[PDB]
Amino acid sequence: SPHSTPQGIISTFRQCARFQQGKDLQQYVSVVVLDEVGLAEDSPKMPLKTLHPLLEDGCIEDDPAPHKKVGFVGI
Amino acid sequence: SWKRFVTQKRMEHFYLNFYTAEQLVYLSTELRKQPPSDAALTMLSFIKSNCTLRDVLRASVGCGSEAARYRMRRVMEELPLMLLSEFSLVDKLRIIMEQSMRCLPAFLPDCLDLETLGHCLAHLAGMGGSPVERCLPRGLQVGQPNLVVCGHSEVLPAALAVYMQTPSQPLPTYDEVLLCTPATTFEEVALLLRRCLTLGSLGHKVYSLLFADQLSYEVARQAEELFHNLCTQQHREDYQLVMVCDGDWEHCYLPSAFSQHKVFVTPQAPLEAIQAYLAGHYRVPKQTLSAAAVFNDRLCVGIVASERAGVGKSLYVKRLHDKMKMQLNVKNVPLKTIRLIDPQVDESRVLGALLPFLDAQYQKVPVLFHLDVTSSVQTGIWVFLFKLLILQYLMDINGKMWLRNPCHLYIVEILERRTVPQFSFLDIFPKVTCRPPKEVIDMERSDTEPGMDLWEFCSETFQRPYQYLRRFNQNQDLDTFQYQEGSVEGTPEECLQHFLFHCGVINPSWSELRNFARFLNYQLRDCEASLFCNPSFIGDTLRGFKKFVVTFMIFMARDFATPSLHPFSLRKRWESEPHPYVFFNDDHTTMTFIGFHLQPNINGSVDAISHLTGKVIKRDVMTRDLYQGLLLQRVPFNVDFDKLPRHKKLERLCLTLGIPQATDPDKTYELTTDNMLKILAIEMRFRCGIPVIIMGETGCGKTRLIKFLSDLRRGGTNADTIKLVKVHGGTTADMIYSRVREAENVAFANKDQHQLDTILFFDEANTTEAISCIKEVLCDHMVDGQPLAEDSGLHIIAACNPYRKHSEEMICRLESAGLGYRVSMEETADRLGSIPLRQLVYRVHALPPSLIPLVWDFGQLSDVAEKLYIQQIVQRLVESISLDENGTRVITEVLCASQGFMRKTEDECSFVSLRDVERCVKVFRWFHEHSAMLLAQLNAFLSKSSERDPVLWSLMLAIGVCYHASLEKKDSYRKAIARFFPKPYDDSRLLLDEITRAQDLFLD
């Protein structure tokens, strides 16, 4: 939503990562689904900025790890 | 009940209104201590300047009435009985609440009640010097709430004129002036109104509420209510209250409420009077030890400004600090630098940075504060400067307060963001204007118009090129000349004249001239150290060598020094210019020539030609005699590196770089002449000291080239000689500083153990405003104001994404997708000036103007390199999954065709790169793995609806997912791709059919 903050997206990605932790990533996957992304596009909070790192590795400042790379669909 | 109690006590005690609730809690706790905190004493200073423990102790006497101790003792005796009389917890709590409002010291003996604090503050105020007696200008009435309505630019000067009426009275502070903002809380306005109307004060001060229009509706309403209420009660019948608003916003609540009071004679003063007033108040007496002594007229505040970058602001501050260390005879003079990076000034960061200095040791010691307002800052600057420089204060509601001490010097480094009044606000301040070289020659000593710094003019960097050029222009003999270290010749004017003449730029900054001089100095040093200039060792075979060296190096500098850029005025190309490079190898015996050939002409001279086109680049670089002599020395002229073997290329490269071993770390990287020139350029810049900022599309080869160079220099040693940081919009300044410091430590370690230099690389730096911090690292050679450690072996590289705009058709597709954008391009705040960011191909912010002259194009990715990278990727796939040659050919040709079609389709795709091909190959691989099972299901599924090569099938579905789906004109893509598929698969219809059958199989 226009009021969604970066922390919401970060916590969503982190939760998907916690789900992927400890499992075989060739048989299990966790996906992040964002609904109504366009609403956040030009909000003053600019949450979508976080997407670039989180899509690449799954971490903004944390060190890379396999379980942090989750799937993603934005609708 | 507590709120009523606080309001009543605030009416009974005047000085409590100087502070808020949390500030009062802080003071109540601290003052009982021995000694109080320096913060508390600073907070009190706004009532009694230079408040000390002795002042608080003297003020405490009398306020501690014995009647208060009687009340305390009585309540301490009574409360046990009162609480025993009531049984419910809620009644006990109510009793406690009442008794706490009656006598708090009985409960909290370590804290002052509001009454004792009020008395102490009043005693402090009365111990002070003379009261402030101010007079209102003509047109403004005492006892009446006056209102002024003006243009934004006039708001601040007008308030200043109000106080100008009494130029002998001290400048005001937060007590007298409040600058309103949308975030301004009701507590601040309420305390201002209480200070104006309430009694208890000793003088007729003036109270101003500026930019009132910005106040929120709720705050303005509450302020009006409080104002009227105060006027109903026993109040000051001679109060002087002024509101100032922006005429454009006059329609809002506060300007409307007081429209009747509107005054039509707007106060104003000439710029000269404001200048003299501020200068007088800033002037520090002779007896007070202060930093100001170095400044022009003992002014404790000063501005350093320029019309463009690289003109000596930071240098001026450095020279000022040195002069202060020399003149003041003090063992040390602390220097604090503060960098303002955020577009909206964050006063809390500045306050946090300054707070460490509140300690008493600094209160009577020369200290210099340097505030750098980078180009990133766009808003909040004039308010901040008004508050700190004029109102002498900074504050957060948290309670901590900074007061500007006259024993300290404050210098602001800013670029003149002039865009309307008759003068800019900065002009009111004492200002130093730094000029570029050409203005320095033309207009010219003064202390506000600095010219050529004498330490630089006497440096090797300027002197060696200066002496060489001085002899060169007069055609004097250079064969015998030799620069003696420390020698000095000529004057600053002739040095500037020669540099500007040969520089190549018309109106250069000082940084550009420094980079030119540094380059020519480095290469002339290498020339002097070579054997061709050693004690004779040649007889006289090399007549004119230095003349040629000077001419050619003056030409070569054109590439490194000259800009490469000319709202979106930022682009130029790399292939548009020749890259003739000459290097003096560390062996002092050989030279390397790249990027050009030497051709003898009929004129008896030798000309420079392009190795590719053969066209003349520059004529008369040398005479034929020198050319023959250099050939007799076996100098590699007219070499064609493109035809040489791989190992010969590697050897020439390692020799020129100074590497001893040609250990090939990557046989796949193609060592073409262009890549070798690019490497040699980055090397030269690392060597001479010029920052490296590159501009290029993604996938053009920056990362691979840097990795190849790092590996080649590493020589197989197990060390992390390179750190790559991928910058993004979320990359803050702290992340950059931490990465730089970690890289500096790693570089020191690598240099100590393995004697290896370290590279730090920032990719997509422009994506964030923190890019301005990267400027500090590259040009200023500092980190958060702290200087970098030289000789650590750390080199920094930055890559900038290009500034491109989507086509209009593509922008239409974007604006038309779905229900359209939630915000219109006009209302957007995410914009690069006039252009919204969503219309850009890369989300990039503006470059700091100091970096603009340094950026150079890395070059576009040619079709041949694209095809070769595709071939490498397909071959890796072949090895991984056992493909044949036919499939390899088909995949390569089809991926090339897809990239070409998407590049041509400017109405649907603006961004094309090699990463997409990796993505598509990944999809192909996945389809191949499952291809066995999925096709079986397909055969079953299709049997319900009553032969395929897994490779071409997986290719079809990969193309479908990666390219076919994103497109709208799918038919053209399928038509183009079909040509490359073997028969009978060379039909767009069959591709669509197979994609559809797969989609069906998946829905089943």
Ligand SMILES: Nc1ncnc2c1ncn2[C@@H]1O[C@H](COP(=O)(O)OP(=O)(O)OP(=O)(O)O)[C@@H](O)[C@H]1O
């Ligand atoms: N007379 C001179 N005036 C200014 N700079 C000089 C002079 N002589 C040599 N220089 C060189 O020019 C460079 C000027 O850098 P400076 O710190 O002035 O940039 P700046 O004014 O802070 O620009 P920006 O704030 O945009 O970075 C210095 O590195 C210095 O070595």
Ligand SMILES: [Mg+2]
């Ligand atoms: Mg500077």
